[PDB]
Design a protein around this ligand. Structure first.
Ligand SMILES: CCn1c(=O)c2c(c3ccc(C)nc31)O[C@@](C)(CCO)C[C@H]2C=C(C)C
Ligand SMILES: [Mg+2]
Ligand SMILES: [Zn+2]
Length: 324
């Protein structure tokens, strides 16, 4: 069985790795095994002197703090975003662009970006006067919490995977991870996309064709939209993967809508299981969010992402075709 798992983990560089099998094959440890595999693939343990037992211990603690009883925002989603970010980092148009520390930041940020998600939206947490919303003053409530939890777990026993980074290295990594995870809040998406469009329109490259990033502002914005793309990459995956993601997000949305209905609150969009159009919501999701973003990212790394954009447009047509 580890033989099969080890074979499925050979695909870790491929879009459309079957992350759900890896979840089953790994005993519901997709985040640990995929993270461990990717760190070995990128030689990160050696570059940053990460003891392997420390890495495993942190990853398993971190994975434990995703909710097994939340349908979408769980450790499988975390593993999938880690692995999608890992592929996006390897695109030819970005070769030698980012430092090891920046690569570490983006992969780490992807691993922690939804930890301890309770399965309800920011607006729900605000409207129900939750402790989370009270702590974080209604601003990117979930995303601030994911960060706090992700960094806090580094202090548990034998969990500081960054123990051998220099002081300046940790400082920079910490700031970069915060900037990246706060960018996963959808309230930031329009401004993020506008900057990405502006960068594409004014795009600069080097002699060897690779993207040229002069300054922190441009470098972090690319890493922010990269992880954001990976977060919104479900409709770009092979359809049998996409559809299982759609099942999971809709079940989590419906359960929030049930709570909203129990409390006499207005039901959030797409959360009313008695008035839901799964298919229409996926088409609108693609048309108004995912395709605008992925089309702009494809422009940035053209033509590296042509196949991923083709898949997204095929999946959009397929969900559209299923509207009665
Ligand atoms: C049902 C359609 N749908 C969404 O509406 C949303 C998705 C999402 C993810 C996967 C699939 C398949 N569908 C999704 O992800 C979010 C929650 C992840 C990042 O916060 C973005 C949320 C989008 C909003 C609220 C405009
Ligand atoms: Mg999130
Ligand atoms: Zn997410």
């Amino acid at each position: 069985q580890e033989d099969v798992l080890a074979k499925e983990l050979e695909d870790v560089n491929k879009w459309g790795l079957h992350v759900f099998r890896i979840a089953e094959l790994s005993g519901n440890r997709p985040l640990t095994v995929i993270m461990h595999t990717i760190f070995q693939e990128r030689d990160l343990l050696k570059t940053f002197k990460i003891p392997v037992d420390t890495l495993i211990t942190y990853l398993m603690t971190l994975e434990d703090h995703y909710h097994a009883d939340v349908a979408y925002h769980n450790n499988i989603h975390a593993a999938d975003v880690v692995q999608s970010t890992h592929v996006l980092l390897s695109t030819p148009a970005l070769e030698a662009v980012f430092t090891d520390l920046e690569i570490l930041a983006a992969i780490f940020a992807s691993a922690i970006h939804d930890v301890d998600h309770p399965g309800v939206s920011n607006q729900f947490l605000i409207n129900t006067n939750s402790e989370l919303a009270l702590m974080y003053n209604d601003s990117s409530v979930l995303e601030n919490h994911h960060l706090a939890v992700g960094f806090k777990l580094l202090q548990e026993e034998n969990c500081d995977i960054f123990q051998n980074l220099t002081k300046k290295q940790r400082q920079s990594l910490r700031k970069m991870v915060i900037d990246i995870v706060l960018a996963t809040d959808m309230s930031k998406h329009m401004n993020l996309l506008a900057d990405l469009k502006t960068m594409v329109e004014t795009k600069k490259v080097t002699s060897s064709g690779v993207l040229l990033l002069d300054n922190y502002s441009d470098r972090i914005q690319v890493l922010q939209n990269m992880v954001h793309c990976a977060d919104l990459s479900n409709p770009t995956k092979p359809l049998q993967l996409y559809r299982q993601w759609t099942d999971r997000i809709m079940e989590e949305f419906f359960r929030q809508g049930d709570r909203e209905r129990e409390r006499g609150m207005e039901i959030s969009p797409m959360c009313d299981k008695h008035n839901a159009s799964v298919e229409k919501s996926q088409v609108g999701f693609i048309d108004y969010i995912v395709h605008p973003l992925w089309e702009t990212w494809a422009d940035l790394v053209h033509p590296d992402a042509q196949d991923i954009l083709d898949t997204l447009e095929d999946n959009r047509e397929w969900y559209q075709s299923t509207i009665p």
